[PDB]
Amino acid sequence: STTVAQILKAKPDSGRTIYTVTKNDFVYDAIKLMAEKGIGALLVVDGDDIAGIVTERDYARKVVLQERSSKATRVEEIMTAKVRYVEPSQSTDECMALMTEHRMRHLPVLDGGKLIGLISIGDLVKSVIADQQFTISQ
Amino acid sequence: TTVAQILKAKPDSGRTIYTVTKNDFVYDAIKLMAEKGIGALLVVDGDDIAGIVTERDYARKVVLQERSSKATRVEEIMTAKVRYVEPSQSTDECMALMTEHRMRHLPVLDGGKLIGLISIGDLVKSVIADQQFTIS
Ligand SMILES: NC(=O)c1ccc[n+]([C@@H]2O[C@H](COP(=O)([O-])OP(=O)(O)OC[C@H]3O[C@@H](n4cnc5c(N)ncnc54)[C@H](O)[C@@H]3O)[C@@H](O)[C@H]2O)c1
Ligand SMILES: NC(=O)c1ccc[n+]([C@@H]2O[C@H](COP(=O)([O-])OP(=O)(O)OC[C@H]3O[C@@H](n4cnc5c(N)ncnc54)[C@H](O)[C@@H]3O)[C@@H](O)[C@H]2O)c1
Ligand SMILES: Nc1ncnc2c1ncn2[C@@H]1O[C@H](COP(=O)(O)O)[C@@H](O)[C@H]1O
Ligand SMILES: Nc1ncnc2c1ncn2[C@@H]1O[C@H](COP(=O)(O)O)[C@@H](O)[C@H]1O
């Protein structure tokens, strides 16, 4: 088994950086920040406690299709509150099952109740093939 | 495991491809993605593959550019240079492509004929679909 710890150590710097917004932030500001960092999710924090999680999938489904403006809508209105998480001990296979079964591409990592990072379906796919050999022609 | 097997694994053997035209409005693309529970649409120019548009394009190229989805065409935000695979190819190859090129969707062509579409989630499922897990 390859672990969540190992996935984070591979991440740049060294998975320690979690990009974040508060519940009161405008959705528009969430979307601008995602764009600035090249990411598709933000952990929603209200002063150190995990409030929820908001992603590009949330923005595509719950704003303009609901007659809302990202500028006049707050993150809380579209985020998922019941956040599923993993611990650094868990295997990538377990993580992939969770993502598949619950239809989510992001998993915060809590260690003893401390948020230590965040992993995504992309980090998991990379670990599956990262050491395999390919050709440009293949 | 092959792309063909990934397609076979899907409910209608992956025969359905949810599609839009280059002239359609982004809002109609977005509406349709919601309607069908998906994150991408193949963009057709009346029977030829013109591009691909995903929830990521929508997140990046519309309101952040002062545009409205009712007032913007799919062509404006789509990716015109589409990468694809054929059924012969292995899931590892598809995973590498998605990782290296930062895309989560691959149309599947067979002899220049579109047969279906696979996503990063189809690949991840194949990796663990046979594996045993407990709730605990
Ligand atoms: N070449 C690579 O190193 C690499 C790594 C990861 C993903 N990818 C690919 O790029 C695309 C990335 O999308 P994804 O589907 O994994 O989702 P994503 O775009 O949300 O994730 C991209 C990277 O940013 C990180 N990230 C996302 N949200 C974060 C947050 N709030 N705080 C801190 N870090 C965060 C992820 O852990 C991941 O490493 C996919 O096509 C995937 O295959 C490539
Ligand atoms: N339980 C399952 O069987 C299952 C299967 C696939 C994905 N997932 C999960 O659900 C989420 C789905 O996201 P995703 O990131 O793979 O992207 P997605 O939301 O675009 O894909 C969802 C499913 O719809 C299909 N699809 C998407 N666009 C299509 C189009 N234009 N035409 C035809 N089919 C299309 C995909 O191939 C995939 O099977 C992820 O968390 C993933 O892990 C679960
Ligand atoms: N760790 C998580 N726990 C619970 N829900 C999540 C998590 N990550 C994402 N989601 C939600 O699941 C949906 C898809 O997210 P994603 O596939 O990560 O874009 C969105 O409605 C998200 O808010
Ligand atoms: N098969 C593909 N070929 C080329 N570009 C793609 C492909 N799939 C998605 N993209 C683009 O890559 C970015 C991320 O897409 P996705 O991860 O599939 O949401 C978006 O700008 C898409 O338009």
Q: DSSP string covering chain A, please?
A: --BHHHHHHHSGGGS----EE-SSSBHHHHHHHHHHHT-SEEEEESSSSEEEEEEHHHHHHHSGGGT--TTT-BGGGTSBSS---B-TTSBHHHHHHHHHHHT-SEEEEEETTEEEEEEEHHHHHHHHHTT----S--
Question: Structure resolution in Å?
Answer: 2.1
Closest CA to A31 of A65, A69, A66: A69
Element (H, E) at B96: helix B91-101
Closest CA to B121 of B98, B100, B93, B89: B98
Q: Which of A66, A47, A50, A56 is nearest to A27 (CA)?
A: A56
Strand B49-54 relative to strand B40-44, pairing:
antiparallel
CATH code, B12: 3.10.580.10
**Smallest Cα–Cα separation from A83: which of A60, A62, A125, A55?**
A55
Residue A42, both tokens: 């933000």
Between strands B19-21 and A20-21, the pairing is unpaired
Contacts of B128 in chain A (CB under 8 A): 93, 96-97, 100
Residue A64 backbone phi and psi in degrees, to 5:
-65, -30
- Scan for tokens 């209105």, then name that residue: A77
Estimate the crossing angle of helix B120-128 against helix B91-101, to 10 degrees.
Answer: 140
CA A24-A26-A29 angle, to 5 degrees, is 125
Number of independent structural domains in chain B: 1
Instruction: Name B53's bridge partners.
Output: B41
Reading across the β-sheet that carries B19-21, which strands appear in turn? B19-21, B40-44, B49-54
**Token output for B48:** 């030829």
At B15, the amino acid letter reads R
Residues A101, A94: Cα–Cα separation, whole Å: 11
CB A41 within 8 A of CB A75: no
In this complex, do B127 and A93 lie within 8 Å of one another by their Cβ atoms? Answer: yes
Q: How far is A14 from chain B (nearest CA, A)?
A: 19
- Do A60 and B133 count as a contact with CB atoms less than 8 A apart? no
Residue A12, judged by CB atoms within 10 A of its CB (0-12, 13-18, 19+), counts as: exposed
Burial class, B33, CB count within 10 angstroms (exposed 0-12 / middle 13-18 / buried 19+)? buried
Q: Which atom of ligand 4 is nearest to the CA of B60?
A: 21
Neighbours of B50 (CB within 10 A): 20
- Residue A41 has, within 13 A of its CA and on its CB side, a CA count of 22
In terms of Cα–Cα distance, which of A88, A87, A109, A117 is closest to A19?
A117
Determine contact, residues B56/B49, Cβ cutoff 8 Å.
no
Q: Quick one: DSSP state of residue B81?
A: S
B18 touches B116 (CB < 8 A): no
Q: Is the peptide bond before A14 cis (omega within 30 degrees of 0)?
A: yes
Q: Is B73 annotated as a binding residue?
A: no
Any ligand 4 atom below 6 A from CB of B83: yes
Q: A136 CA distance to ligand 4 centroid (A)?
A: 19
CB A86 within 8 A of CB B133: no
Range of the domain at A108: 1-138
Tell me whether residue B31 is annotated as binding: no
